């Protein structure tokens, strides 16, 4: 998963 503001 991707950082949250990606």
């Amino acid at each position, epitope marked *: *998963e*991707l950082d949250k*503001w990606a």
Partner: antibody
Amino acid sequence: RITLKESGPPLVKPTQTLTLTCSFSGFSLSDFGVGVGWIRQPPGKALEWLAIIYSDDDKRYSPSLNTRLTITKDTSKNQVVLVMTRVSPVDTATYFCAHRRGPTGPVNAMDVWGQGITVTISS
Amino acid sequence: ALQLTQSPSSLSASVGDRITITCRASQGVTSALAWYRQKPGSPPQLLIYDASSLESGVPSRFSGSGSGTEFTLTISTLRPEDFATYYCQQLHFYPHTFGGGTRVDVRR
């Protein structure tokens, strides 16, 4: 501006639970985006990422420490709590909690850190 | 997860020296990379955020560049207060990862 701080027990025994608290002031967990993470650092070793929790509650842990960590936030106190269970001497380190901005590009870093609290495990 | 290879892992310099340290990412992290300086006994201190942006209040001698998998932190002129350990951290993927750190001591 923003200052954060770690409280908790400096001495903890193998197996038990380590509850850490991040008290901050200069921002709130009501601000959109704002995150608060926990970074630990063993003695003389590198920084290790533990977990992050945001202004609206999504939390992410460390895949390695996932079943042992629980992060929460009390917005009435502006505190973040971290519970790590069944600790062993390898968990001995300095624990830091830091602030992460929110979108206003620069939420790409943890701009202000606690001063750190060094926990030591020893029965 | 995502590996970050800092190098050199240890460095030896003098004041007024110019040194460039890198941080390699196993996967492209765009520009979500931060740099910190850490003096013994003190907590990390943000120098560069978003890979190339100088953090407010940090001396101009520090600078950063890179994108994707290659990143560097340069100190145009080394100061006494710069002999510490430096770390890079990426905030593009979870978990957020730190490099192993680079050490800068006084050369003799």
